[PDB]
Amino acid sequence: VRPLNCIVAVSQNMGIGKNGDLPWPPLRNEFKYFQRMTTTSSVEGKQNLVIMGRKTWFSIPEKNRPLKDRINIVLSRELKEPPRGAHFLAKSLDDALRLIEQPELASKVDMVWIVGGSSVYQEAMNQPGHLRLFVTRIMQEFESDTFFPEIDLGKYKLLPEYPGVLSEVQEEKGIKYKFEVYEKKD
Ligand SMILES: NC(=O)C1=CN([C@@H]2O[C@H](COP(=O)(O)OP(=O)(O)OC[C@H]3O[C@@H](n4cnc5c(N)ncnc54)[C@@H](OP(=O)(O)O)[C@@H]3O)[C@@H](O)[C@H]2O)C=CC1
Ligand SMILES: COc1ccccc1/C(C)=C/c1coc2nc(N)nc(N)c12
């Protein structure tokens, strides 16, 4: 509800997204990791919350919306009502972050996850205060529309280990990848 966790999978050249779509074919096992981490609350009774840009929301198949057992926030300057299935609409990241700390909510809500789009990652990453970046390194270049903001290594500490995160190289369909956790405190 207070540290901001961003979670992203990123190609070697920093690619995320191609034509409203991922740069790589379905990595189904990497999705498992995304689901367990964003979903796994640390208090029974409380749900984790996800915040995403509007194009990311409509890029999720409708049969998977909202992301289940998580409170779903959509950001949009043009929508007036939440998208069907979304729990909240907010007009800026700041609105979203203020809502989450409200007494009525903060107590239904445990961890806050930024799950994308480029725009939402950039902004989260200009937040002062405690940030974590859960970065899937896809060890391979893929042709991309959009890209992930530079990870300033003076600002972000690579955690050597992190609870429940396995550090060995993984592979699925000939695509190698690994899980990293970065941290910017304060
Ligand atoms: N590799 C990965 O792990 C991930 C990749 N993706 C990919 O990333 C790409 C999507 O990125 P992108 O194009 O940036 O899409 P976004 O999901 O960030 O959507 C951008 C839109 O979200 C709203 N928005 C963004 N920032 C704000 C803000 N600060 N306040 C209010 N509203 C905001 C929009 O609303 P409006 O037009 O309604 O005002 C803006 O047009 C796709 O290719 C997708 O597949 C997505 C998640 C993860
Ligand atoms: C448009 O994509 C999706 C389609 C269906 C369901 C969920 C997602 C999202 C938003 C998938 C992700 C958003 O941030 C992520 N970080 C990592 N490491 N892995 C992921 N799969 C995602």
Method: X-ray
Residues 174, 40: Cα–Cα separation, whole Å = 28
Instruction: Tell me the CATH number at 45.
Output: 3.40.430.10
Residues 97, 4: Cα–Cα separation, whole Å = 9
Burial (CB < 10 A; 0-12, 13-18, 19+), residue 152, is exposed
Tokens of 37: 């981490």
Residue 175's φ and ψ, nearest 5 degrees, are: -110, 115
Domain residue limits at 107? 1-186
3-class DSSP assignment, residue 84: coil
3-class DSSP assignment, residue 87: coil
3-class DSSP assignment, residue 179: strand
User: What Rg, from alpha-carbon coordinates, does the chain have?
Assistant: 16
The residue whose C-alpha atom lies closest to atom 22 belonging to ligand 2 is 8
Query: Could you identify the atom of ligand 1 that is nearest to the CA of residue 21?
Result: 45
The residue whose C-alpha atom lies closest to atom 9 belonging to ligand 1 is 17
Q: What total number of domains does the chain contain?
A: 1
Tokens of 15: 């690619």
- Cβ(122) – ligand 1 distance below 6 Å: no
Residues 128, 104: Cα–Cα separation, whole Å = 24
- Cβ(64) – ligand 2 distance below 6 Å: yes
